[PDB]
Design a protein around this nucleic acid. Sequence first.
RNA 1: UGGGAGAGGGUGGUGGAAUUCCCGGAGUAGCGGUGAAAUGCGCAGAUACCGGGAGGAACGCCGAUGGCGAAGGCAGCCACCUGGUCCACCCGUGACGCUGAGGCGCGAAAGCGUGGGGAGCAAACCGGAUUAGAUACCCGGGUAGUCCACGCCCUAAACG
RNA 2: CCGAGGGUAGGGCCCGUGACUGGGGCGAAGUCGUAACAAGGUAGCUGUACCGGAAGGUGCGGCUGGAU
RNA 3: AAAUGUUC
RNA 4: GCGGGGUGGAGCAGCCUGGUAGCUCGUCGGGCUCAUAACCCGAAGGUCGUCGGUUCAAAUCCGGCCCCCGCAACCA
RNA 5: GCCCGGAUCCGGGCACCA
RNA 6: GAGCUAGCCCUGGCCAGGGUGAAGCUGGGGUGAGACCCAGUGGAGGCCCGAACCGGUGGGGGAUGCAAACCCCUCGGAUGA
RNA 7: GAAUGCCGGCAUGAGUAACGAUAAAGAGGGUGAGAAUCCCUCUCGCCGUAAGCCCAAGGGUUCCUACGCAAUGGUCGUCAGCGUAGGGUUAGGCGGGACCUAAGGUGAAGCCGAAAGGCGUAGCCGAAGGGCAGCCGGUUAAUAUUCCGGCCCUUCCCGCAGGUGCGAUGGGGGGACGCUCUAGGCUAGGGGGACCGGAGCCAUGGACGAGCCCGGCCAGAAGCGCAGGGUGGGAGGUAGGCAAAUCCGCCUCCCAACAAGCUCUGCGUGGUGGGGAAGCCCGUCGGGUGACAACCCCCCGAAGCCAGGGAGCCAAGAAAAGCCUCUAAGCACAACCUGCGGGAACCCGUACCGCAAACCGACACAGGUGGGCGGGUGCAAGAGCACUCAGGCGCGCGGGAGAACCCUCGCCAAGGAACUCUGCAAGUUGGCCCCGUAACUUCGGGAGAAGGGGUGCUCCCUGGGGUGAUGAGCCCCGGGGAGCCGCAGUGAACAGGCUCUGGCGACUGUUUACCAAAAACACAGCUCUCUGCGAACUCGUAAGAGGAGGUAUAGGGAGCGACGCUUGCCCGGUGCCGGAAGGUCAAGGGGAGGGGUGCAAGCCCCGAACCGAAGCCCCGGUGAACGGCGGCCGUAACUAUAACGGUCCUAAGGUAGCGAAAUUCCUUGUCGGGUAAGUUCCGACCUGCACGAAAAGCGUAACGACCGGAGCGCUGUCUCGGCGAGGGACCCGGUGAAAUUGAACUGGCCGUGAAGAUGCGGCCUACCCGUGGCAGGACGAAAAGACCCCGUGGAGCUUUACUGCAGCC
RNA 8: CGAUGUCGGCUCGUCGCAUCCUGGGGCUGAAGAAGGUCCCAAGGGUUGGGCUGUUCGCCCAUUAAAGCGGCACGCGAGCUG
Lengths: 275, 48
Amino acid sequence: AVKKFKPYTPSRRFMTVADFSEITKTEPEKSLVKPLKKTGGRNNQGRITVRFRGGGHKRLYRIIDFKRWDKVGIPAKVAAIEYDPNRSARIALLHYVDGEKRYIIAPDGLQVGQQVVAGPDAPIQVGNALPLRFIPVGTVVHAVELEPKKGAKLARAAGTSAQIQGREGDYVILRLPSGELRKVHGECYATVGAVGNADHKNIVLGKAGRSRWLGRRPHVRGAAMNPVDHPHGGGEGRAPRGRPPASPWGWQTKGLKTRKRRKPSSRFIIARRKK
Amino acid sequence: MKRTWQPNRRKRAKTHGFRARMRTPGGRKVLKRRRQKGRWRLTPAVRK
RNA sequence: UGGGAGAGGGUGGUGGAAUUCCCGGAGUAGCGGUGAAAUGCGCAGAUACCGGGAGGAACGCCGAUGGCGAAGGCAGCCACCUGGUCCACCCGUGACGCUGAGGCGCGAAAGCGUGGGGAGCAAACCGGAUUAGAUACCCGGGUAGUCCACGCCCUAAACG
RNA sequence: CCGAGGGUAGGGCCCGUGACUGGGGCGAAGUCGUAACAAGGUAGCUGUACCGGAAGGUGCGGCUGGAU
RNA sequence: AAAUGUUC
RNA sequence: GCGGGGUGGAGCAGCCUGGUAGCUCGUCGGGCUCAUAACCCGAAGGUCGUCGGUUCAAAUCCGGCCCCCGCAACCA
RNA sequence: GCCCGGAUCCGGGCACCA
RNA sequence: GAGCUAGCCCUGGCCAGGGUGAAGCUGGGGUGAGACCCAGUGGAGGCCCGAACCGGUGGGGGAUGCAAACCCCUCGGAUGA
RNA sequence: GAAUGCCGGCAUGAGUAACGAUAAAGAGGGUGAGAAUCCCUCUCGCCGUAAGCCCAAGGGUUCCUACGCAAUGGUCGUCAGCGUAGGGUUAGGCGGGACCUAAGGUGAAGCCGAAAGGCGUAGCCGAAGGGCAGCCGGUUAAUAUUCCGGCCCUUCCCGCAGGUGCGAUGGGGGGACGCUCUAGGCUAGGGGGACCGGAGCCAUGGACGAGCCCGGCCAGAAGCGCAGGGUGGGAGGUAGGCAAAUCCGCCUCCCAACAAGCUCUGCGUGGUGGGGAAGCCCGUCGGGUGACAACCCCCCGAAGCCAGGGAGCCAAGAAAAGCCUCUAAGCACAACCUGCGGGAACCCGUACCGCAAACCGACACAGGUGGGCGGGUGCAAGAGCACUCAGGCGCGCGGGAGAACCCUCGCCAAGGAACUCUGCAAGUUGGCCCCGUAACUUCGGGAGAAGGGGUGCUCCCUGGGGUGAUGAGCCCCGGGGAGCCGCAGUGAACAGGCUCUGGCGACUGUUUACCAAAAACACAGCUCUCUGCGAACUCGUAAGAGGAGGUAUAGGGAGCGACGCUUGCCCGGUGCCGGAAGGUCAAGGGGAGGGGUGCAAGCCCCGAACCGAAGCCCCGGUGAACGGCGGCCGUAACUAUAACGGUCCUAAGGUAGCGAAAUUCCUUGUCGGGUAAGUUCCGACCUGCACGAAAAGCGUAACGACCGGAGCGCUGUCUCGGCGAGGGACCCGGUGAAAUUGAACUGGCCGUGAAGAUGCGGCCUACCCGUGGCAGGACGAAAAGACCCCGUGGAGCUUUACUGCAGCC
RNA sequence: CGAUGUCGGCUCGUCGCAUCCUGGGGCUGAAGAAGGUCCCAAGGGUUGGGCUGUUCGCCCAUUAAAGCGGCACGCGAGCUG
Ligand SMILES: CC(=O)c1cccc(N[C@H]2[C@H](N)[C@@](NC(=O)N(C)C)([C@H](C)O)[C@@](C)(O)[C@@]2(O)COC(=O)c2c(C)cccc2O)c1
Ligand SMILES: [K+]
Ligand SMILES: [Mg+2]
Ligand SMILES: [Mg+2]
Ligand SMILES: [Mg+2]
Ligand SMILES: [Mg+2]
Ligand SMILES: [Mg+2]
Ligand SMILES: [Mg+2]
Ligand SMILES: [Mg+2]
Ligand SMILES: [Mg+2]
Ligand SMILES: [Mg+2]
Ligand SMILES: [Mg+2]
Ligand SMILES: [Mg+2]
Ligand SMILES: [Mg+2]
Ligand SMILES: [Mg+2]
Ligand SMILES: [Mg+2]
Ligand SMILES: [Mg+2]
Ligand SMILES: [Mg+2]
Ligand SMILES: [Mg+2]
Ligand SMILES: [Mg+2]
Ligand SMILES: [Mg+2]
Ligand SMILES: [Mg+2]
Ligand SMILES: [Mg+2]
Ligand SMILES: [Mg+2]
Ligand SMILES: [Mg+2]
Ligand SMILES: [Mg+2]
Ligand SMILES: [Mg+2]
Ligand SMILES: [Mg+2]
Ligand SMILES: [Mg+2]
Ligand SMILES: [Mg+2]
Ligand SMILES: [Mg+2]
Ligand SMILES: [Mg+2]
Ligand SMILES: [Mg+2]
Ligand SMILES: [Mg+2]
Ligand SMILES: [Mg+2]
Ligand SMILES: [Mg+2]
Ligand SMILES: [Mg+2]
Ligand SMILES: [Mg+2]
Ligand SMILES: [Mg+2]
Ligand SMILES: [Mg+2]
Ligand SMILES: [Mg+2]
Ligand SMILES: [Mg+2]
Ligand SMILES: [Mg+2]
Ligand SMILES: [Mg+2]
Ligand SMILES: [Mg+2]
Ligand SMILES: [Mg+2]
Ligand SMILES: [Mg+2]
Ligand SMILES: [Mg+2]
Ligand SMILES: [Mg+2]
Ligand SMILES: [Mg+2]
Ligand SMILES: [Mg+2]
Ligand SMILES: [Mg+2]
Ligand SMILES: [Mg+2]
Ligand SMILES: [Mg+2]
Ligand SMILES: [Mg+2]
Ligand SMILES: [Mg+2]
Ligand SMILES: [Mg+2]
Ligand SMILES: [Mg+2]
Ligand SMILES: [Mg+2]
Ligand SMILES: [Mg+2]
Ligand SMILES: [Mg+2]
Ligand SMILES: [Mg+2]
Ligand SMILES: [Mg+2]
Ligand SMILES: [Mg+2]
Ligand SMILES: [Mg+2]
Ligand SMILES: [Mg+2]
Ligand SMILES: [Mg+2]
Ligand SMILES: [Mg+2]
Ligand SMILES: [Mg+2]
Ligand SMILES: [Mg+2]
Ligand SMILES: [Mg+2]
Ligand SMILES: [Mg+2]
Ligand SMILES: [Mg+2]
Ligand SMILES: [Mg+2]
Ligand SMILES: [Mg+2]
Ligand SMILES: [Mg+2]
Ligand SMILES: [Mg+2]
Ligand SMILES: [Mg+2]
Ligand SMILES: [Mg+2]
Ligand SMILES: [Mg+2]
Ligand SMILES: [Mg+2]
Ligand SMILES: [Mg+2]
Ligand SMILES: [Mg+2]
Ligand SMILES: [Mg+2]
Ligand SMILES: [Mg+2]
Ligand SMILES: [Mg+2]
Ligand SMILES: [Mg+2]
Ligand SMILES: [Mg+2]
Ligand SMILES: [Mg+2]
Ligand SMILES: [Mg+2]
Ligand SMILES: [Mg+2]
Ligand SMILES: [Mg+2]
Ligand SMILES: [Mg+2]
Ligand SMILES: [Mg+2]
Ligand SMILES: [Mg+2]
Ligand SMILES: [Mg+2]
Ligand SMILES: [Mg+2]
Ligand SMILES: [Mg+2]
Ligand SMILES: [Mg+2]
Ligand SMILES: [Mg+2]
Ligand SMILES: [Mg+2]
Ligand SMILES: [Mg+2]
Ligand SMILES: [Mg+2]
Ligand SMILES: [Mg+2]
Ligand SMILES: [Mg+2]
Ligand SMILES: [Mg+2]
Ligand SMILES: [Mg+2]
Ligand SMILES: [Mg+2]
Ligand SMILES: [Mg+2]
Ligand SMILES: [Mg+2]
Ligand SMILES: [Mg+2]
Ligand SMILES: [Mg+2]
Ligand SMILES: [Mg+2]
Ligand SMILES: [Mg+2]
Ligand SMILES: [Mg+2]
Ligand SMILES: [Mg+2]
Ligand SMILES: [Mg+2]
Ligand SMILES: [Mg+2]
Ligand SMILES: [Mg+2]
Ligand SMILES: [Mg+2]
Ligand SMILES: [Mg+2]
Ligand SMILES: [Mg+2]
Ligand SMILES: [Mg+2]
Ligand SMILES: [Mg+2]
Ligand SMILES: [Mg+2]
Ligand SMILES: [Mg+2]
Ligand SMILES: [Mg+2]
Ligand SMILES: [Mg+2]
Ligand SMILES: [Mg+2]
Ligand SMILES: [Mg+2]
Ligand SMILES: [Mg+2]
Ligand SMILES: [Mg+2]
Ligand SMILES: [Mg+2]
Ligand SMILES: [Mg+2]
Ligand SMILES: [Mg+2]
Ligand SMILES: [Mg+2]
Ligand SMILES: [Mg+2]
Ligand SMILES: [Mg+2]
Ligand SMILES: [Mg+2]
Ligand SMILES: [Mg+2]
Ligand SMILES: [Mg+2]
Ligand SMILES: [Mg+2]
Ligand SMILES: [Mg+2]
Ligand SMILES: [Mg+2]
Ligand SMILES: [Mg+2]
Ligand SMILES: [Mg+2]
Ligand SMILES: [Mg+2]
Ligand SMILES: [Mg+2]
Ligand SMILES: [Mg+2]
Ligand SMILES: [Mg+2]
Ligand SMILES: [Mg+2]
Ligand SMILES: [Mg+2]
Ligand SMILES: [Mg+2]
Ligand SMILES: [Mg+2]
Ligand SMILES: [Mg+2]
Ligand SMILES: [Mg+2]
Ligand SMILES: [Mg+2]
Ligand SMILES: [Mg+2]
Ligand SMILES: [Mg+2]
Ligand SMILES: [Mg+2]
Ligand SMILES: [Mg+2]
Ligand SMILES: [Mg+2]
Ligand SMILES: [Mg+2]
Ligand SMILES: [Mg+2]
Ligand SMILES: [Mg+2]
Ligand SMILES: [Mg+2]
Ligand SMILES: [Mg+2]
Ligand SMILES: [Mg+2]
Ligand SMILES: [Mg+2]
Ligand SMILES: [Mg+2]
Ligand SMILES: [Mg+2]
Ligand SMILES: [Mg+2]
Ligand SMILES: [Mg+2]
Ligand SMILES: [Mg+2]
Ligand SMILES: [Mg+2]
Ligand SMILES: [Mg+2]
Ligand SMILES: [Mg+2]
Ligand SMILES: [Mg+2]
Ligand SMILES: [Mg+2]
Ligand SMILES: [Mg+2]
Ligand SMILES: [Mg+2]
Ligand SMILES: [Mg+2]
Ligand SMILES: [Mg+2]
Ligand SMILES: [Mg+2]
Ligand SMILES: [Mg+2]
Ligand SMILES: [Mg+2]
Ligand SMILES: [Mg+2]
Ligand SMILES: [Mg+2]
Ligand SMILES: [Mg+2]
Ligand SMILES: [Mg+2]
Ligand SMILES: [Mg+2]
Ligand SMILES: [Mg+2]
Ligand SMILES: [Mg+2]
Ligand SMILES: [Mg+2]
Ligand SMILES: [Mg+2]
Ligand SMILES: [Mg+2]
Ligand SMILES: [Mg+2]
Ligand SMILES: [Mg+2]
Ligand SMILES: [Mg+2]
Ligand SMILES: [Mg+2]
Ligand SMILES: [Mg+2]
Ligand SMILES: [Mg+2]
Ligand SMILES: [Mg+2]
Ligand SMILES: [Mg+2]
Ligand SMILES: [Mg+2]
Ligand SMILES: [Mg+2]
Ligand SMILES: [Mg+2]
Ligand SMILES: [Mg+2]
């Protein structure tokens, strides 16, 4: 579930935190962590290129295995389920019978101590990874590759999933978490089941400070600025937009589609997203 | 109150130093310029 | 002890008919709708027809003056978990009973909260009619909602 | 010491009264509609919700104290 | 089709 | 100061582009109804705010004047 | 200004303006 | 030119004392089981009071100043954005 | 001769202001030409979580000694951070380097860019992080973990012995990590002692006392003891740790696991080496003595040590080397490990200041400057507050006087906000313990609500804890009586005034460095929208980055702004979205038909229909997209008003809720409340000049150095002022500015004058020159008015101004 | 316009008189008392408060009376702001 607080401070009145029920190991695998290089939203020119970023808790990167097809037929045991501060999803620690240890994102229903495997021959079971073409049409699926051997790109967020809708040649048809209908190549791997920690979105940050812990610096409205800064800048007292609502760089921000029309992947998207 | 000059030897040598100047087209033009004017010091003095 | 009938309840799963939308084919001058019409939809190729797809909701015939439950109420089909209940036998306990202010639970619909879901339907709402008017009845649209999970609300011509 | 009571401070119940406001009752022959009673000219009532000058309408579910 | 009918 | 207006009883056309004033309602006379409303058939009523001027002719074009809406009235 | 349009002239279509 | 200032990055450091007493846990009560109630334990928090530290609210002084922004009295934050 | 001209020089203001914290001085004795100012002594005051002491920046000889006083020093100077000179900084162990990585920087390979250059995996560089071997004392005028003395330790090289498959930049382990809280045991540090050691002291009424006063330790190898950290052992299998591996990882079996063993730290002890006071002597910083100094017991006790300890929590907490292990080439007369021995051990820093007179502030400048130590007592605690130890200071002009006035301070009869824009300011209140505490509420709160009582000292009785031993002592919480004193017991210092009621913002936060701290920004939360990943978006010509080693429960953009209850109608215009038709549509295609030239083949030019994208037109959608949400006339059996109607217009005519409002012009609307009196305030009404629903609407507990209104308390705010204090002002000695200044021999009135006259006219008044004072004038000073206009002057900003460009299509 | 600081308050006044009071008068539709109205008169006097930034004004309570106006709408090298 999601844990609440009594209002013993103003902020604690609404703050909710994850329950951390599923977490079985409270420190990572030392040989699976490298330092995460905090950027502050700055690129190699030293320029902010994504505004309002920096100052969050220090983190260690946990190396996640987004291939899995790396180890076909070598089963693994789910040793523990751990916190990962770099993603919404929990991660599961795999002890391969090989003796290799790797991380995966923890699907919903994974129980520590169970056994998973990857490959065409694998059982259609929560935690296993197969190429899409060998997965029954209709099963829920996460950590999906988008092109063969290129890595799991789709459905990795807490609670998310994709569902296989049908097949057509070398391609299967997935419904992405967004509701889009895309053709994804059949030889692309995917782990059956949905990603765990579905309660993640029910979390109320509760106070300004919590956002700051997440490295999210305060966002300031255009309307709060001056004409030098933003299309919505200036005006005497409060002002309505007074033009079509715009980004700091001038382009319209209410409805203006921005996916490039002539994208080569257009042939593969059947139906643009849901709501 | 805290004023603008806050001496720091490493800062001084790394910013205005001989090697910093030589490392850049502008810096070399400075050195060229101060040599042409015949400055006694091409670069700010600093005790390392 | 042994047997019974049943839409009693909860969970999981699954089947076909229909409506809608989408894709393909084929086809053309209207379709729809009413008291009559208009709005609406249609040569930007609609209706009607065939194939494929997606999704949600309700389960036709059986079906009854029927069955079950304390009441609200419960209807495709399968399994699981579970309540009541009747009958046979005349085996066991020996009045252990009845009712029940408070208390506790349950309680159709609508409604509310947080997430999902959204085909059909449809408060509000828009339009077309009717009309003296028509903030209505009729027609074309259409949002909550109707559906699921969890938590509230605790009303009723909750009636025999 | 206790002590009538006086004084200070803060509560509780009650009563009178108050600009204005909310509906209620009553008032021989005001204004607008015609919701209900005959299938009352859309059967009615109903709990609820939303809406509308007003009666009321509509959705959802119920009831017959309805159909003939 | 068809709204309404002053009071005792 | 600048723009717009004034026409049957009411609310609005016509003016720009001179000659011929129109629409809904109201009012009046008939019908229908026991009667009333609605409905149906017919009809009256504006010399166009006022006074000037232009024109053969002015609701109409042009000037004053009387009203009536609107907008402005800022810098110390 | 010219060409493409309809029942000399309104349609319009593009373009020019010292 | 970022030795001032603004943001971020890496790596260290600092925050007297006192107050309030969340969750949890234990025991008791409760019930079919529960919820839940009670006491104890516990030690949460952009929680409270208040130094250092960071501020700069009001007033007064200063105004060729001690000072090109300072001093005094007050006053804000002070485990956190 | 003028340019607020330029450079220089010298005047005026002027013996004026000032001489830089109000912590404070007095005397005696030295020195010297000269002394308030230098040295010495005594007395006095100031700091003492410093105004004392270590360290790091930065500074760069300022350090020490001799000799100086021209200048520097806000005065003086014999003195000095000043002048001249001489001296002074000593390391294998401290800091940095010959070690390691962090961001970042650089950069074989590689990528990009007219040039210059930009990037870039490894690698290299990069520290206040990791790693690493020295502690105590003595010595110098000046250095000392550096020299010396004692006791210790590290690496490198060689050698001897013992031992082993030795061997690396490769594999693995370890290094290696957060926040808050916290156990045990120690140490640093502290308090006490009737015990130990000590020069002495008995005063002024008393005390020869268990009197007073001083001191009662520091370092220490191995071993030992205590306290802690780290850590399983064995076997078999093996496909993983880009080769190999006996290591590591995974599987199995065995044994044992709040132990132990092994190992490493801390602390104690410890051969030994040091230290060692008051006092009064000699000094004038130190010495000698004390002294064979003593070197003990009890208590308090860390935030520090064992430390990589423990628990809980979520926001989930560097790297790399040293080090250990595994093997690879290799090599196994080698090599490594262990013990011992001999030898070897480099470069740079080291003075001094360092919360300041030596750093940053032009100054010996009331400002700024990171880390550690920071004693005692008492006040609940404490780094707070008062006093005080060690130690350091009296702030580099003084002496007087005792005016106005100013500053900072103290008290005040009666009154008590009557002050004023405003209780501005200053009173009041004030800590702790106990009693007690309302509306409302989101059940936390509002709370320190409000309000009240207590508080010292003495004696008697007594409860529990720590330490020890279960006792004595010491220490820590209490409880109960009976008393004493004073005006008063947190007797000094430090330490809330309270309440009622509105506006705005939910809240903690943030902001215009240096006139605005707020109602502004942020904020959790809500919604819209874009984005399928080589994402969108952003920075860049690009490469490349950020986004993100993320993936729609995610990322960008926008508005709104906890929460509650809500968020209506308009899609005609603009925006965005959808629409394979139609309309227009550029280059290009096409080439009917015409032309220039040529004797000609030919060469060359113009060129219609038709084909031909996006965009625009056109058809729809869309409001938490830009935005918009009417007018006139009539009507109720009293008046008044209009539920109702008529009609024009609109894309549609403002719903709920609010309303004279941070919005109301008229306006101090009207009425009600509060006041003796209320342009403010609160509650209402509604013809809302000109509220209204995410530029959100109406509410909202709590919160606020926000802005209103009111009451109690208390006051020098005031009636209305008085007195007192200190620092200035004043006088004397020392030093001695400034802006300003056409020149000046610079009066009043009434006139006149370019319209406000010391300067002109007429009259009047007036001996010459100062000092303290006050500010009416000199259209006083300052600043080439910042308002306004002007200039075909400039810049920032905007858009459906013009015209380009990037970007996108 | 190479600067004449701008409302209101406060403080300090000083002048005018078209006199608010006090003093002296005439006329009165002046019985007395008390008023009206004009004349003479500037010596003195001319209050405290509620509201507002206010001047002004209204209001409370008084008063003999609660005067009006000039002085750069007197007065910021006097203060306030
Ligand atoms: C049969 C006949 O004459 C006729 C004509 C036209 C229409 C109709 N049918 C119906 C009329 N249009 C009516 N119904 C309707 O339109 N439907 C599609 C059912 C309307 C909603 O009110 C009705 C209920 O009034 C109606 O049933 C009769 O009422 C009147 O018509 C009506 C009213 C209400 C007032 C005056 C006249 C009328 O006709 C009937
Ligand atoms: K102006
Ligand atoms: Mg909560
Ligand atoms: Mg969780
Ligand atoms: Mg690592
Ligand atoms: Mg870089
Ligand atoms: Mg760079
Ligand atoms: Mg950005
Ligand atoms: Mg950023
Ligand atoms: Mg996670
Ligand atoms: Mg974070
Ligand atoms: Mg914002
Ligand atoms: Mg702004
Ligand atoms: Mg800018
Ligand atoms: Mg702009
Ligand atoms: Mg704007
Ligand atoms: Mg603005
Ligand atoms: Mg603004
Ligand atoms: Mg505005
Ligand atoms: Mg605007
Ligand atoms: Mg807006
Ligand atoms: Mg606009
Ligand atoms: Mg725009
Ligand atoms: Mg999509
Ligand atoms: Mg400077
Ligand atoms: Mg600095
Ligand atoms: Mg340096
Ligand atoms: Mg440095
Ligand atoms: Mg530096
Ligand atoms: Mg350099
Ligand atoms: Mg070169
Ligand atoms: Mg030079
Ligand atoms: Mg030279
Ligand atoms: Mg240089
Ligand atoms: Mg066609
Ligand atoms: Mg669907
Ligand atoms: Mg019963
Ligand atoms: Mg329901
Ligand atoms: Mg309609
Ligand atoms: Mg009708
Ligand atoms: Mg109507
Ligand atoms: Mg809803
Ligand atoms: Mg119910
Ligand atoms: Mg008495
Ligand atoms: Mg009826
Ligand atoms: Mg009805
Ligand atoms: Mg009916
Ligand atoms: Mg109405
Ligand atoms: Mg309706
Ligand atoms: Mg029904
Ligand atoms: Mg009627
Ligand atoms: Mg016209
Ligand atoms: Mg009859
Ligand atoms: Mg009739
Ligand atoms: Mg005519
Ligand atoms: Mg005429
Ligand atoms: Mg203007
Ligand atoms: Mg710096
Ligand atoms: Mg706490
Ligand atoms: Mg508190
Ligand atoms: Mg201040
Ligand atoms: Mg100043
Ligand atoms: Mg100060
Ligand atoms: Mg403070
Ligand atoms: Mg505080
Ligand atoms: Mg001349
Ligand atoms: Mg001059
Ligand atoms: Mg000049
Ligand atoms: Mg002089
Ligand atoms: Mg003078
Ligand atoms: Mg001075
Ligand atoms: Mg001074
Ligand atoms: Mg001095
Ligand atoms: Mg002297
Ligand atoms: Mg002398
Ligand atoms: Mg002195
Ligand atoms: Mg001396
Ligand atoms: Mg002390
Ligand atoms: Mg102190
Ligand atoms: Mg000298
Ligand atoms: Mg001399
Ligand atoms: Mg001298
Ligand atoms: Mg000097
Ligand atoms: Mg001197
Ligand atoms: Mg000086
Ligand atoms: Mg001498
Ligand atoms: Mg040595
Ligand atoms: Mg060497
Ligand atoms: Mg190195
Ligand atoms: Mg290195
Ligand atoms: Mg470097
Ligand atoms: Mg280092
Ligand atoms: Mg070292
Ligand atoms: Mg030595
Ligand atoms: Mg070995
Ligand atoms: Mg780690
Ligand atoms: Mg570290
Ligand atoms: Mg020790
Ligand atoms: Mg002590
Ligand atoms: Mg192996
Ligand atoms: Mg290998
Ligand atoms: Mg000695
Ligand atoms: Mg001796
Ligand atoms: Mg440690
Ligand atoms: Mg935490
Ligand atoms: Mg070999
Ligand atoms: Mg050999
Ligand atoms: Mg060397
Ligand atoms: Mg050398
Ligand atoms: Mg050296
Ligand atoms: Mg040294
Ligand atoms: Mg310091
Ligand atoms: Mg000094
Ligand atoms: Mg300065
Ligand atoms: Mg000095
Ligand atoms: Mg100083
Ligand atoms: Mg205290
Ligand atoms: Mg002094
Ligand atoms: Mg004197
Ligand atoms: Mg007094
Ligand atoms: Mg009082
Ligand atoms: Mg009083
Ligand atoms: Mg007052
Ligand atoms: Mg106090
Ligand atoms: Mg409560
Ligand atoms: Mg109290
Ligand atoms: Mg006493
Ligand atoms: Mg306080
Ligand atoms: Mg705020
Ligand atoms: Mg604010
Ligand atoms: Mg400021
Ligand atoms: Mg400013
Ligand atoms: Mg500035
Ligand atoms: Mg500024
Ligand atoms: Mg200020
Ligand atoms: Mg503030
Ligand atoms: Mg804000
Ligand atoms: Mg919300
Ligand atoms: Mg760009
Ligand atoms: Mg990344
Ligand atoms: Mg806002
Ligand atoms: Mg629209
Ligand atoms: Mg449209
Ligand atoms: Mg539109
Ligand atoms: Mg073309
Ligand atoms: Mg096109
Ligand atoms: Mg809206
Ligand atoms: Mg519009
Ligand atoms: Mg409006
Ligand atoms: Mg509406
Ligand atoms: Mg409504
Ligand atoms: Mg109002
Ligand atoms: Mg009012
Ligand atoms: Mg007003
Ligand atoms: Mg006004
Ligand atoms: Mg009104
Ligand atoms: Mg809005
Ligand atoms: Mg409000
Ligand atoms: Mg509430
Ligand atoms: Mg509020
Ligand atoms: Mg509130
Ligand atoms: Mg606040
Ligand atoms: Mg505030
Ligand atoms: Mg007030
Ligand atoms: Mg006074
Ligand atoms: Mg004095
Ligand atoms: Mg004299
Ligand atoms: Mg001068
Ligand atoms: Mg002259
Ligand atoms: Mg002269
Ligand atoms: Mg003279
Ligand atoms: Mg004149
Ligand atoms: Mg004159
Ligand atoms: Mg004169
Ligand atoms: Mg003359
Ligand atoms: Mg004369
Ligand atoms: Mg005279
Ligand atoms: Mg003067
Ligand atoms: Mg003057
Ligand atoms: Mg003046
Ligand atoms: Mg100036
Ligand atoms: Mg100039
Ligand atoms: Mg000028
Ligand atoms: Mg100027
Ligand atoms: Mg002007
Ligand atoms: Mg011009
Ligand atoms: Mg001109
Ligand atoms: Mg210009
Ligand atoms: Mg410009
Ligand atoms: Mg773009
Ligand atoms: Mg001027
Ligand atoms: Mg001047
Ligand atoms: Mg001037
Ligand atoms: Mg008289
Ligand atoms: Mg009389
Ligand atoms: Mg007088
Ligand atoms: Mg006034
Ligand atoms: Mg007024
Ligand atoms: Mg009188
Ligand atoms: Mg003046
Ligand atoms: Mg005037
Ligand atoms: Mg004036
Ligand atoms: Mg005046
Ligand atoms: Mg003035
Ligand atoms: Mg002033
Ligand atoms: Mg003034
Ligand atoms: Mg002046
Ligand atoms: Mg004055």
